[PDB]
Design a binder for this molecule. Structure first.
Ligand SMILES: Nc1ncnc2c1ncn2[C@@H]1O[C@H](CSCC[C@H](N)C(=O)O)[C@@H](O)[C@H]1O
Ligand SMILES: Nc1ncnc2c1ncn2[C@@H]1O[C@H](CSCC[C@H](N)C(=O)O)[C@@H](O)[C@H]1O
Ligand SMILES: O=C1c2cccc(O)c2C(=O)c2c(O)cc(O)cc21
Ligand SMILES: O=C1c2cccc(O)c2C(=O)c2c(O)cc(O)cc21
Ligand code: NA
Lengths: 319, 319
């Protein structure tokens, strides 16, 4: 049936997880045809059982079968690279913490606590729990770094960064957005604000330990907020954009950059943001509405096309 | 993207799970259009957050949206019935025990210990663990009961049960197959062999606590073995069929009934049998081979069509 295979959709995720997390996928580099019998002798993986997994991977379109051998498909070459963002995605997707968060999702819909399904399972909100968990934090921060590394080339193309002097990336994570921007845009003051127990170090990057719910530091003329607001509710999103308006002067600009809600694409991510953060995906006009409540105005609006999702580039300034 | 939504396939299962497990799907009986605002006041679910889950269910084809109201699809009416086979399926599919089993699947490929990924996660083989876990056993036994109730109509159609006198259903679970056969085929002796701590009770069904790995009891002219062999290896499958031969005489008949591997259908179930049992999916000829190794001869092979999978009906006698 099609409904029973829809019920059994998790089996598709778990099969890819077993293929990628073990490191078996890293034997399929440069679109080579792998002999599974030779892979069995080299790595010690069970020939008969892994051959059954490969047949299911061929069904999913991850592998391609020819000449009694298997290659990764054109689109699934990323699984050969353990450094790829797709590798970090599946490692987090069906991990025990996410699984337990999903099992509290149903129950979380009836609660008016303000606690996410993640918090009900674990006892702390996502980012606070990550502070005491290397696995979740390292994989999450790594994923955020890879997607930051992918988009940066297009950001520099669509927006002139040389017109600015003092740049702050609010919730910048490991800080790879401004590090890569600073390499191609020279002789500027660069700062990255996030929650740091230990401050990261990089040449001409000012790492700040702070909280964007409490306050943003003033005196900067370019502010960046990439993939933050979709981890928050409307009220918290307004509170963040309010703290920008207090900090920002007349000359200042805020680049609200985020994955955007387009009808054509999947709502699956919208549900994940509800489970992990009690947040949501938003459209251009939804982002614009929250900005208007905070006391900000939309000057420019452009779309950035990434492989996995469309992005919403919004240049905001104060009233 | 197509790759990231294949990676995020677990989100479909988990979204259906939250919809069914809570009992929100039971409000969508007989294809009625549910107002979510009305459902919010009645049951107490968050309006905005459940509305977002419904929009994702519309994308999956579980719900249909017309005039800001949601009904179940023609195929997905089953989710309205909490005692449906599909309702028990999703309740087991992404439960913590299955999740932890899948997370040991990758590691289990490199072991030649004879331990399933389930046993590696939980410390005992599947059925032995179900003895000390009512959640898994009651849901599993219930699922096996519902699929037994679905097939019995077609099974009575394609085989003459009136010719037989003494009937034993080996690994018959709660015994719903023989109970439904006994209701229409009257005046026969009926017995259901399985692993019972406490014997089930039913009108003229002889429930036997036993072990088909150890021996099958002799003195029956009809034997049934439905959806057992796909929970076992080839050697264990041969051991069971050998125990049938030693039990059976020249006039005896064994109905080997099981979900069969057809190229057209998904390999997803084959991987689940590997994770849970170290079992496998098998074709007609593969089933035929194991029977011939055990010293059984095929009399009559037929195909039974079911909604979710094709079934192999193999009549076996000794020689
Ligand atoms: N109260 C808070 N103050 C500052 N940073 C916070 C915060 N709550 C969450 N964050 C940070 O917000 C980030 C959200 S993920 C986005 C990371 C980065 N901007 C990127 O696009 O790749 C995380 O790095 C998290 O640590
Ligand atoms: N060693 C053993 N001896 C007897 N029954 C066993 C067994 N190991 C597993 N079983 C039983 O085999 C069944 C597998 S599921 C099949 C149940 C039923 N025949 C149906 O098709 O619906 C379970 O009920 C399980 O309890
Ligand atoms: O894959 C992503 C992701 C990709 C691109 C941009 C993103 O922001 C994310 C993101 O936030 C995210 C997440 O919060 C939790 C996840 O398990 C996975 C992802
Ligand atoms: O849905 C089934 C199922 C359906 C029909 C016939 C079956 O045998 C099964 C079965 O065995 C099974 C299982 O062993 C574990 C599961 O999580 C789900 C199922
Ligand atoms: Na390896």
């Amino acid at each position: 049936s099609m409904l029973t295979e829809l019920i059994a959709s998790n089996r598709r995720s778990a099969a890819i997880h077993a293929f990628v997390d073990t490191g078996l996928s890293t034997h399929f580099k440069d679109g080579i045809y792998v002999d599974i019998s030779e892979l069995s002798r080299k790595s010690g993986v069970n020939y008969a059982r892994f051959s059954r997994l490969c047949d299911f991977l061929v069904e999913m379109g991850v592998l391609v079968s020819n000449d009694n051998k298997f290659r990764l498909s054109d689109e699934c070459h990323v699984f050969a690279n353990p450094e790829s963002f797709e590798s970090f995605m599946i490692k987090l997707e069906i991990c025990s913490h996410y699984s337990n968060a999903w099992l509290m999702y149903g129950k979380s819909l009836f609660e008016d606590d303000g606690k996410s399904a993640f918090e009900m399972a674990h006892g702390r909100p996502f980012f606070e729990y990550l502070d005491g968990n290397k696995f979740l934090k390292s994989n999450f921060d790594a994923l955020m770094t890879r997607v930051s590394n992918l988009i940066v080339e297009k950001l520099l193309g669509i927006y002139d960064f040389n017109q600015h002097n003092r740049i702050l990336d609010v919730g910048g994570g490991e800080g790879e957005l401004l590090v890569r921007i600073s390499e191609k845009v020279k002789g500027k003051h660069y700062a990255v604000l996030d929650r740091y127990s230990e401050l990261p170090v990089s040449d001409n990057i000012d790492f700040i330990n702070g909280n964007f719910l409490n306050s943003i530091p003033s005196g900067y003329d370019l502010y960046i907020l990439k993939n933050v607001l979709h981890n928050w509710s409307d009220s918290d999103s307004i509170l963040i954009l309010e703290n920008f308006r207090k900090a920002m002067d007349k000359n200042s600009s805020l680049l609200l950059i985020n994955m955007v809600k387009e009808p054509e694409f999947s709502r699956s991510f919208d549900i994940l943001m509800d489970v992990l953060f009690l947040g949501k995906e938003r459209s251009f006009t939804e982002f614009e509405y929250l900005a208007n409540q905070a006391g900000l105005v939309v000057q420019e609006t452009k779309v950035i096309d990434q492989s996995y999702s469309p992005y919403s580039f919004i240049k905001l300034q104060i009233k």
